[PDB]
Amino acid sequence: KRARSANIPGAILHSLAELQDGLNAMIDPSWRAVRSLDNWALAITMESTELLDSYPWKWWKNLNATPDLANVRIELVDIFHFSLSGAMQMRSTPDDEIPAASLKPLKEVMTTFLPAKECTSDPYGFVFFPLTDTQNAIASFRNIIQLANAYRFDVIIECIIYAAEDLGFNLVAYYIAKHTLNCIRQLSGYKDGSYVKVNNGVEDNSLLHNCIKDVSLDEVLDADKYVQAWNSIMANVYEAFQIKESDRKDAERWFALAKENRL
Amino acid sequence: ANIPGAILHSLAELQDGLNAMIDPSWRAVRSLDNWALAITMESTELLDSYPWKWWKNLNATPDLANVRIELVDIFHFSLSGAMQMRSTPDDEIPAASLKPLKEVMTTFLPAKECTSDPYGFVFFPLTDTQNAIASFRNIIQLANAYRFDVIIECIIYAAEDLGFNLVAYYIAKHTLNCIRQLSGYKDGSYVKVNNGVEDNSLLHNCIKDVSLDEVLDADKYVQAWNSIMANVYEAFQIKESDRKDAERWFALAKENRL
Ligand SMILES: O=c1ccn([C@H]2C[C@H](O)[C@@H](CO)O2)c(=O)[nH]1
Numbered sequence: 182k183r184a185r186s187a188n189i190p191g192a193i194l195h196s197l198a199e200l201q202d203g204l205n206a207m208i209d210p211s212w213r214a215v216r217s218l219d220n221w222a223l224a225i226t227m228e229s230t231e232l233l234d235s236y237p238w239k240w241w242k243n244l245n246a247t248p249d250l251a252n253v254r255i256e257l258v259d260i261f262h263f264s265l266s267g268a269m270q271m272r273s274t275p276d277d278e279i280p281a282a283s284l285k286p287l288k289e290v291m292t293t294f295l296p297a298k299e300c301t302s303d304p305y306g307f308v309f310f311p312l313t314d315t316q317n318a319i320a321s322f323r324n325i326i327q328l329a330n331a332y333r334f335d336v337i338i339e340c341i342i343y344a345a346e347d348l349g350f351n352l353v354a355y356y357i358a359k360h361t362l363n364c365i366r367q368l369s370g371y372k373d374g375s376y377v378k379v380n381n382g383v384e385d386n387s388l389l390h391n392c393i394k395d396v397s398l399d400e401v402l403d404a405d406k407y408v409q410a411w412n413s414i415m416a417n418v419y420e421a422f423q424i425k426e427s428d429r430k431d432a433e434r435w436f437a438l439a440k441e442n443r444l
Numbered sequence: 445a446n447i448p449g450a451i452l453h454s455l456a457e458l459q460d461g462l463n464a465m466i467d468p469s470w471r472a473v474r475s476l477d478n479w480a481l482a483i484t485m486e487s488t489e490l491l492d493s494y495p496w497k498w499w500k501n502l503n504a505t506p507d508l509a510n511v512r513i514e515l516v517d518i519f520h521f522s523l524s525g526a527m528q529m530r531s532t533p534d535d536e537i538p539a540a541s542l543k544p545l546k547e548v549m550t551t552f553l554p555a556k557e558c559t560s561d562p563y564g565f566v567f568f569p570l571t572d573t574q575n576a577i578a579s580f581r582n583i584i585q586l587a588n589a590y591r592f593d594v595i596i597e598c599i600i601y602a603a604e605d606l607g608f609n610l611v612a613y614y615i616a617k618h619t620l621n622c623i624r625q626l627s628g629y630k631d632g633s634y635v636k637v638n639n640g641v642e643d644n645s646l647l648h649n650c651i652k653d654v655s656l657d658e659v660l661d662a663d664k665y666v667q668a669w670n671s672i673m674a675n676v677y678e679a680f681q682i683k684e685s686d687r688k689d690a691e692r693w694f695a696l697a698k699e700n701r702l
């Protein structure tokens with residue numbers, strides 16, 4: 182009986198897209214009309230450098246620092262949100278509005294950065310392992326920025342999947358946890374000043390780690406168990422931030438809202 | 445309003461000196477990619493001064509004070525990269541640096557009509573968030589193609605559009621960068637920000653009344669730079685014996701060039 186890998190199945194990625202759609206709609210109901218392909222590319226650019234700032238890349242400051250891999254995990258998940266949004270916006274975009282660079286061959290619109298020291302990479306050759314190494318991370322994310330600039334949101338999703346695998350965490354489980362926090366943020370006034378990330382010492386991102394301790398790679402991808410698996414993660418995050426029941430949503434509600442919008 | 449060539453050449457010498465203070469053989473230790481990365485990272489710090497997020501803090505205003513600082517940080521790194529290219533043997537020169545600009549980037553353009561610098565990479569007014577975004581997504585691509593040259597030119601046009609004195613700000617942040625190395629930045633005994641007080645933000649009042657003519661005058665500039673240096677040193681209460689002046693840095697650089 183064959184072990185399931187990290188290589189998110191089509192059906193699972195569609196369900197993820199429905200959650201992403203729901204979250205984006207909380208932010209603006211007409212989000213596909215108001216957002217641009219460049220917004221998502223910019224967002225990925227900005228998170229890519231935030232992620233890189235988790236590593237000790239600076240030679241003039243804090244010379245003995247080590248990588249903050251907990252922050253890297255969350256940032257990879259943030260990049261996944263934006264890339265998934267971009268890949269789905271690209272499917273929604275009319276062909277006369279499709280930017281020429283997305284259709285040009287990659288070689289023409291990017292130069293691939295390689296680390297100096299021998300390493301393994303993902304199948305495209307854009308991301309480099311191990312990601313515990315700062316030089317590997319630097320070349321990887323310099324490559325991701327260039328992919329974003331040529332609108333290759335789907336290539337980026339693939340890379341992030343291989344990255345999560347190298348770093349040995351459950352991408353999908355983290356996605357669900359952060360997706361739930363993102364929803365909580367919007368409910369709680371992130372747009373105006375009302376909600377702030379830092380709450381009496383700790384960043385809100387930091388509470389998600391315990392919310393996904395009890396989930397397995399299979400639990401979260403398996404057609405039979407995933408809806409319940411996802412729902413328990415949402416529940417853990419909601420309960421962590423003391424969100425009343427009437428404000429919560431379960432996975433099946435997000436699928437339903439996605440489907441009715443599909444009319 | 446643009447920096448005479450001979451002034452640039454002298455800024456490079458202060459930059460050389462600051463880099464040597466950080467690592468004695470900086471040219472052999474650092475790589476082209478180090479500087480290109482630095483510029484990338486500072487470019488996103490610059491964009492993060494603008495209200496670019498559509499999901500959060502929707503009434504935020506651009507922090508153009510911080511943009512001034514970041515432009516000057518990119519300036520430090522772009523001067524360093526340009527010098528690195530000059531010292532890199534031809535057979536180690538990355539091939540992307542020799543290609544026509546059209547081949548190594550896709551020029552992002554804002555949606556709304558605007559003016560730009562002469563290359564068409566930076567867009568005015570830089571008070572506008574989308575103009576800034578398209579500008580620094582272009583700068584990042586220039587860094588990837590090792591075009592430190594072009595970047596320097598773009599930053600100069602940026603400073604002109606934003607109506608501040610690029611050279612004065614450079615000398616001020618340069619001085620701070622020295623102050624940081626003196627105070628133990630490398631081992632964490634000195635921090636850039638604590639209790640809502642960021643060291644960069646105290647620089648503005650040190651150069652408030654400094655004219656463009658002073659700092660660019662190919663015969664008055666040394667004295668002008670020195671007063672900026674002294675004002676920054678004084679604002680951070682640095683001992684006289686821990687201070688260095690322009691001629692010291694020039695002399696260091698002229699001495700190290702043998
Ligand atoms: O339209 C948006 C805007 C923001 N985010 C998420 C992505 C990221 O995880 C978080 C900000 O760090 O907000 C979205 O998913 N969609």
Ligand SMILES: O=c1ccn([C@H]2C[C@H](O)[C@@H](CO)O2)c(=O)[nH]1
Nearest residue numbers: 241462463466516517520521621
């Ligand atoms: O080798 C270096 C390393 C850092 N810095 C300065 C540049 C920038 O102004 C500041 C960090 O923002 O440190 C240099 O000038 N040279």
